[PDB]
Swiss-Prot record:
InterPro entries (alphabetical): Bact_Transpept/Beta-Lactamase, Beta-lactam/transpept-like, PBPA_dimer, PCN-bd_Tpept
Topological domain spans for side Periplasmic: 1-435
Originating organism: Mycobacterium tuberculosis (strain CDC 1551 / Oshkosh)
Pfam families attached to this UniProt entry: PBP_dimer_2 (PF21922), Transpeptidase (PF00905)
Biological role: Transpeptidase that catalyzes cross-linking of the peptidoglycan cell wall. Required for the regulation of cell length.
Region (Transpeptidase): 117-431
Protein name: Peptidoglycan D,D-transpeptidase PbpA
Keywords: Cell inner membrane, Cell membrane, Cell shape, Cell wall biogenesis/degradation, Hydrolase, Membrane, Peptidoglycan synthesis, Signal-anchor, Transmembrane, Transmembrane helix
Catalytic center residues: 179
Xref: PANTHER family: PENICILLIN-BINDING PROTEIN 4B (PTHR30627:SF24), PEPTIDOGLYCAN D,D-TRANSPEPTIDASE (PTHR30627)
GO cellular component: plasma membrane
Length: 435
């Protein structure tokens, strides 16, 4: 450890701003790692610690940041030959500081006090991760201390915190998607040949086949005041029974297949950070299928996966591979690597994506309007999700402008559902993006 602290570790950057850098000190270990906006960027930087090693981008891009990367070998030779103090390379992220800060701020004020959860912003046409927010977060300056006791105390406080602030909730945790998963049930039906004008039950209640279990609308009220409702109408008003009926009519295999087409049960590519796998679940019976259709049973998504669903629809049906690192530099600022955007797969036809967009623009209009942006059209799906064996989660997925999208977001507020919170958070992130 002594020698690797005698060489100046390189910088983690966002928008030409520093997220992590190293300062020359009088310490036995010469360089101290500094995080100037610590809690906000901790999901992106991770920590770099004498006692506890590294996480996130400190760990992923460790060869570049410490200067040991093969691609940096010439610079290291030239410096030693010339007498120059050596320095590691730089990692330039895809994070937009304005959007990251707006996601964080909105999370710290959006639950009459701080929310627990995650915000992800994506650029639909490129796959760039524009923001990666987790709350509560922690201060990596605490683990950068050269004092063993300060590090050990911080490590212990963090690990005993029931809110688990070390966890990057945007990419490492999976949550039931609830109402947001109607986007997938809808996509599956549209692809199988159903249309927006198709008629579905408006009944307040629906039996689940092969069980005494029963599903209901919110909170026992009929979708319309008519016998049935159109698919568009049930989508925009987020009726449950209609979708239980739609999904079972569509069948398990079509639902599974659309779920995989949208990245579920599909091993995620590193960003370079590892992303937990999302799942539609086994769907072992028809009771399960009705429950899967409205985002429950065994469906579990990372906030990132849910932002990608929105980004895929925004991008005309094509999924761009999400990435966090735009380019790697050497100590001179010479380009070592530039990331090139990659089309992962087509999930749905331009037609189905267009249809889903219309429905989502309708769902946004029906929704609570706090934080709406004048002259900007937003396509969205709000929702709640039940979990465990408890207050439901609050979700918002969206993209904007709906006509030619520049940004897609997912907002998850753990336990945030009322009986509103997620959507204004989403819209502040969008607004910051479109500035
Ligand atoms: C979706 O999962 C839920 C639940 C019944 O399963 C329903 C209830 C709500 S919450 C209302 C939030 N309004 C908006 N901004 C919705 C919905 O998102 O409309 N779906």
């Amino acid at each position: 450890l002594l020698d690797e602290y005698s060489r100046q570790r390189g910088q983690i950057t966002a928008g030409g701003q520093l997220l992590a850098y190293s300062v020359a000190t009088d310490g036995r270990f010469r360089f101290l790692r500094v995080y100037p906006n610590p809690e906000v960027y901790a999901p992106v930087t991770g920590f770099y610690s004498l006692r506890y090693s590294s996480t996130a981008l400190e760990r992923a891009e460790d060869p570049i940041l410490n200067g040991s990367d093969r691609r940096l070998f010439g610079r290291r030779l030239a410096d030693f030959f010339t007498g120059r103090d050596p320095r590691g390379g730089n990692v330039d992220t895809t994070i937009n500081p304005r959007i990251q800060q707006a996601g964080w701020d909105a999370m710290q004020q959006g639950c009459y006090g701080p929310c627990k959860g995650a915000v992800v912003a994506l650029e639909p046409s490129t796959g760039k991760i524009l923001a990666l927010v987790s709350s509560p977060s922690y201060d990596p300056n605490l683990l950068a201390s050269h004092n063993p006791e300060v590090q050990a105390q911080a490590w212990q406080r963090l690990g005993d915190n029931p809110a688990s602030p070390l966890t990057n909730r945007a990419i490492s945790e999976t949550y039931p998607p609830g109402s947001t998963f109607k986007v997938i049930t809808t996509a599956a039906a549209l692809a199988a040949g159903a249309t927006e004008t198709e008629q579905l039950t408006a009944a307040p209640t629906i039996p689940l086949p092969g069980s005494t279990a029963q599903l209901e609308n919110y909170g026992g009220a009929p979708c319309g005041d008519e016998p049935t409702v159109s698919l568009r109408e049930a989508f925009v008003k987020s009726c449950n029974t209609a979708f239980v009926q739609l999904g079972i009519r569509t069948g398990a295999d079509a639902l599974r297949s659309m779920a995989r087409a949208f990245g579920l049960d599909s091993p995620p590519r590193p960003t370079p950070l590892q992303v937990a796998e999302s799942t539609v679940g086994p769907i072992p019976d028809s009771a399960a299928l009705g429950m899967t259709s409205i985002g429950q049973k065994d469906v579990a998504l990372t906030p990132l996966a849910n932002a990608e669903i929105a980004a895929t629809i925004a991008n005309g049906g094509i999924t761009m591979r999400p990435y966090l690192v735009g380019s790697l530099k050497g100590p001179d600022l010479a380009n070592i690597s530039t990331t090139v955007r990659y089309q992962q797969r087509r999930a749905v036809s331009p037609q189905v994506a267009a249809k889903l967009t219309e429905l989502m623009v309708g769902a946004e209009k029906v929704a609570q309007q706090k934080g709406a942006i004048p002259g900007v059209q937003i396509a969205s799906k709000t929702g709640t999700a039940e979990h465990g064996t408890t207050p439901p989660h609050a979700w918002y997925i969206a993209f904007a402008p709906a006509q030619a999208p520049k940004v897609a977001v997912a907002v998850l507020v753990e336990n945030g559902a009322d009986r509103a919170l997620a959507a204004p958070i989403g819209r502040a992130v969008i607004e910051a993006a479109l500035q």
